[PDB]
Structure 1
Amino acid sequence: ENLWVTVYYGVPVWKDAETTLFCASHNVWATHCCVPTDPNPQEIVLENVTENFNMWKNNMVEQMHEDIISLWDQSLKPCVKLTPLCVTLNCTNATASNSSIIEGMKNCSFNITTELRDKREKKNALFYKLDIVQLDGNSSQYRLINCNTSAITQACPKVSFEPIPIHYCAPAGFAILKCNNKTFTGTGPCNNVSTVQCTHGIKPVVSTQLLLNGSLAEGEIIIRSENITDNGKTILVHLNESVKIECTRPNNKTRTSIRIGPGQAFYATGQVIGDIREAYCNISESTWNETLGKVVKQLRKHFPHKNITFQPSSGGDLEVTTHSFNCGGEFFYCNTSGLFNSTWDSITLPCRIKQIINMWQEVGRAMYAPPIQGNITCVSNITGLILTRDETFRPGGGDMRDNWRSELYKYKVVKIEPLGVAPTACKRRV
């Protein structure tokens, strides 16, 4: 054939690959993702290039998970332990400022050792019922929730966990491909693909039934699932219009610093000032009714005309039955019943508040959120919904990674392989 091997370097080819991506820009996120972002991101149109994307198997979702857990632990590790407080609590009924009672709170007295490890004193603090477990029946004696399962630590008030956009960048030798076709939906070939080095910034917002502060779908509402005919394989609905949600805790809380040891203190909840309205979230009614109807119209493209209906979660604890909204740093567990209630000016969701949480289903670990003094107001953008199937749908919930997959679905990591060969009609001259 008179052909000889010609070696070429700088060949535009690649392979699917999994590598370590790095993130870029008193805030924990800002401290860790200290690396500057690209002020002028580049993008290559990749003329005549098609590619296979698979969000459900995208390793970046899992890698982002590992980074959030790791960062959380670095931040929480060098802080006060509350295990010295795992004592019997002598509790009475709910109390409040002046002639009132706060349902959901209890006034508890406890025996705390002073810093000299000999003298002992009693202290009083208010606690949420959801953070307290009764020791026996017909008894006033209680203990803190989880003193029978794990160490409880206190988050340091000095550090902010407020989400900031995080940009992920591939290391040298790697690139990130993006699907920019729109209406991509689930897995499969994308016929409009481009190359970038870094992702858009994604804020690490953690929630359950409602996905907050993400990007909006371009075009129509997109329903993403893995084999949509299944009851499992949680469905991610990505809205093209946002819904404003305003959440609040309309009362003035105070904080008491209790010394618990040689360089340690606990932050206790003291008297609460103002009216007692618990907590709640405000959603416009017409906005919700129209938004849900549009979702249904898109469900009708996957399902035949059917008896489509929405119901509240069928069971489990607050972590899966409510909207686990972080708001201002106290944790909100808001009731979505009345939101996911339909058959095919505003409404409010009643909401509960907690201080002791187990984060990403750590279970064997727990964290205590110091109380926030004064009142709290939070406004967020609902950008997507999470649904599961029984055509009855319920919010269900995910593995707490759906709040990443919903943004990372358009990105893929590939290894660049610049070396290759092909035959040519040219023999080496010597």
Structure 2
Amino acid sequence: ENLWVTVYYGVPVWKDAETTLFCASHNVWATHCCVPTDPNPQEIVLENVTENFNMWKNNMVEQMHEDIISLWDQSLKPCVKLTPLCVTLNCTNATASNSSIIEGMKNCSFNITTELRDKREKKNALFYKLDIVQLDGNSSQYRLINCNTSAITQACPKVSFEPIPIHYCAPAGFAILKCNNKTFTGTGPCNNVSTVQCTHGIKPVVSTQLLLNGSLAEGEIIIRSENITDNGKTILVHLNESVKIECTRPNNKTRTSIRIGPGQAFYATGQVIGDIREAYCNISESTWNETLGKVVKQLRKHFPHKNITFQPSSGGDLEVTTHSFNCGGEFFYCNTSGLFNSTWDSITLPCRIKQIINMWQEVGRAMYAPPIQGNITCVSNITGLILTRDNTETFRPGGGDMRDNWRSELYKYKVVKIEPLGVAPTACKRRVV
């Protein structure tokens, strides 16, 4: 009956909000993310704070995606265009030394101009079968796969595009809330929430089917889905133990080049020496089976039906049917049908090599991966799986949107806006002089 309105400023409250985060620390992200990180990052535990977090509705995922695409293109743009190489190619079977046929590669010749406008020369290069298509008649007249619809740009050899961890940081007036518990599993209230200024450092790793080089779950295997009982949703399985996968290219190249402008050399495969297999990956067998069995035990808590079946992917092109890796700048497309394919010392997956890539499943452009000299061996950590569901329970190592590869790292963070003003009742009325 005698309370008065009091105005306060500096009130510790916030609202859900969407803003632009900045990226904090010739590598692509090292160059772009020029803002240094905090040498001693702070974290403030908010005692007695419950916050409703929501994966799949979290716009940071979308923001990370858009900045990655823009940066990717900013780095690729000031490089050599391959337009003059679209001319019809005269192709034969590339020679596999003593075996004599390199299944999967063609030896092509073409008439291309050089650094001078008035000079055209016949040049040779080796190409992968996956990127070469016939014009007609089953004649040896071939086109590069993307000269039919879009520009192809060769990546500059100086740019590795290697993922480095990057940190997303709030602008003044904003804060990032982080979810703890470690049983969060998707959406809803999270207790024991802490406040940070920047994320922990996420590498922008690009893969399909399996999730590589992410964080491991602290607790048991976590199966996350917007709606685990519905189909049409990506199921992200986050493992608490990694599976080591070793992938190699058991041969090496000799690189050659063609000037196709004032400098602007085009790099192309000259010769291939080594094993006939283009590539393969080593997955320990016992590790894989234990890991998959543990995943199933957790699936059974959502899926009471016995005999869960895992099958190979159903179809589409390599961006969805095979596992994608970027090792040293080389692009591997690995066949995972040797995995899954069961009901509930190593496994070798054959792998294909591709060079003209419409990365990000874009349709208006493609990048050409220059050849890498020397042999390639990479070891990665499988930290999770991407599954698609469906009479009985069936899952497949399907593909998904790129955003799904970042949700697995960003699920624990939320952005809120600070709102310093508010009111409350008080016992005392303003005194007026």
Whether these two folds match at TM > 0.5 is yes
CA offsets per residue over residues 368-411 of structure 1, 9 Å max, x none? 00000010000000000000011010011111111110000010
Count of residue pairs brought into register by the alignment: 430
Q: How far apart, CA to CA, are the structure 1 residues paired with 2:99 and 2:413?
A: 58
Conserved in 2, the CA contact under 8 Å of 1:112 and 1:122?
Answer: yes
TM-score (norm 2): 0.98
- Counterparts of 1:397 and 1:110 in 2: how far apart (Å)? 37
1:61 is aligned to 2:32: no
Provide the residue aligned with 2:407 in structure 1.
405
Cα distance in structure 1, aligned partners of 2:373 and 2:100: 20
The one-character-per-residue Cα deviations of 1:109-151 (angstroms, maximum 9, x if unpaired) are 0010122222211000000000101111321100101100101
CA contact (8 A) 1:257 1:268 kept: yes
Quick one: percent identity of the two aligned structures?
100
Measured after TM superposition, the shift of residue 98 of structure 1 is 4.4
Report the counterpart of residue 137 of structure 1 in structure 2: 137
Structure 2 residues without counterparts, runs of 5 or longer:
none
What secondary structure does 1:182 align onto? Answer: coil
For residues 265 and 220 of structure 1, the distance between their equivalents in structure 2, rounded to whole angstroms, comes to 52
> 1:264 aligns to what SS in structure 2?
strand
Q: Measure the CA separation in 1 of the matches of 2:60 and 2:300.
A: 31
Displacement over 6 Å in runs of 4+: none
CA distance in 2, matches of 1:308, 1:141: 48
Paired with 1:233 and 1:156, the residues of 2 have a C-alpha distance of: 38
CA distance in 2, matches of 1:27, 1:35: 15
Partners of 1:26 and 1:158 within 8 A in 2: yes
Aligned to 2:180: 180
Tell whether the 8 Å contact from 1:224 to 1:237 is kept in structure 2 after alignment: yes
| Equivalent position of 2:323 in the other structure | 323
Q: Quick check: 2:135–2:142 contact (8 Å CA) kept in 1?
A: yes
State which drifts further: 241-250 or 192-201. 192-201
Residues 28, 159 of structure 2: 8 Å contact kept: yes
What per-residue deviation string (whole Å, max 9, x for no partner) do you get for residues 226-252 of structure 1?
Answer: 111122111000000000000000101
| Partner SS for 2:367 | strand
Shift of 1:305: 2.9
SS at match of 2:296: helix
User: Within 1, Cα distance between the matches of 2:20 and 2:210?
Assistant: 29
Tell me how far 1:101 sits from its aligned partner.
Answer: 2.2
What secondary structure is seen at the aligned counterpart in 1 of 2:274? Answer: coil
Q: Deviations over 1:67-90 (max 9, x none)?
A: 100110110111110011110000
| Distance in 1 (alpha carbons) for counterparts of 2:231 and 2:36 | 43
Given that 2:160 and 2:328 are in contact with CA atoms closer than 8 Å, whether structure 1 keeps it comes out as no
Note the C-alpha offset of 1:311.
0.5
Equivalent pair of 1:76/1:155 in contact (CA under 8 Å): yes
State the distance in 1 between where 2:7 and 2:379 align. 59
- Is this contact kept in 2: 1:26–1:159, CA < 8 A? yes
Q: 2:398 aligns with which of 386, 392, 396?
A: 396
RMSD, aligned CA: 1.0
How many angstroms does 1:44 deviate by? 1.6
Q: Distance in 1 between matches of 2:3 and 2:389?
A: 61
Q: Is the 8 A contact 2:115 2:263 kept in 1?
A: no
Matches of 1:186 and 1:317 in 2, distance apart?
30
Distance 1:20 1:99 in 2: 57
Q: Distance in 2 between matches of 1:69 and 1:225?
A: 25
Q: Secondary structure at the match of 2:100?
A: coil
Aligned counterparts of 2:21 and 2:197: Cα–Cα separation in 1:
10
| Displacement after TM superposition at 1:362 (Å) | 1.2
1:287-339 Cα shifts (integer Å, max 9, x gaps): 00000000000000001132301001111011100001111211000000011
CA distance in 2, matches of 1:256, 1:64: 37
2:340 match: secondary structure? coil
Deviates more, 1:235-244 or 1:271-280: 271-280
**Residue-by-residue CA offset, 1:132-183 (whole Å, 9 max, x unaligned):** 0111132110010110010111100011211000011000000001110111
Distance in 2 of aligned mates of 1:128 and 1:277: 13
Find the aligned partners of 2:231 and 2:336 in 1 and give their Cα distance: 20
Following TM superposition, by how much is the alpha carbon of 1:203 offset from its aligned partner in structure 2, in angstroms?
A: 0.3
Cα offset, 1:99, TM superposition:
4.7
Equivalent residue, structure 1, for 2:422: 420
2:107–2:127 Cα contact (<8 Å) kept: yes
CA distance in 2, matches of 1:14, 1:142: 61
Q: Secondary structure at the match of 1:143?
A: strand
Shift of 1:41: 1.4
Return 347-356 or 183-192, whichever deviates more.
183-192
CA distance in 1, matches of 2:99, 2:291: 43
CA contact (8 A) 2:356 2:368 kept: yes
Query: Does the aligned pair in 2 maintain the 1:97–1:274 contact within 8 Å?
Result: no
Deviations 1:10-65 (A, max 9, x none): 11100000000001111111001111111111112111111100011000000000
Which one is further off, 230-239 or 255-264?
255-264
Q: Tell me the TM-score normalised to structure 1 length.
A: 0.98
Q: Which residue of structure 2 aligns with residue 71 of structure 1? A: 71
Contact 2:319 2:361 survives alignment (8 Å): no
Contact 2:209 2:399 in 1 (8 A): yes
Alpha-carbon distance in 1 for matches of 2:131, 2:386: 27
Mapped contact 1:96–1:271 kept (Cα < 8 A): no
CA distance in 2: counterparts of 1:166 and 1:119, whole angstroms = 47
- Counterpart Cα distance in 1 of 2:124 and 2:135: 19
Q: What's the offset of the Cα at 1:261?
A: 1.1
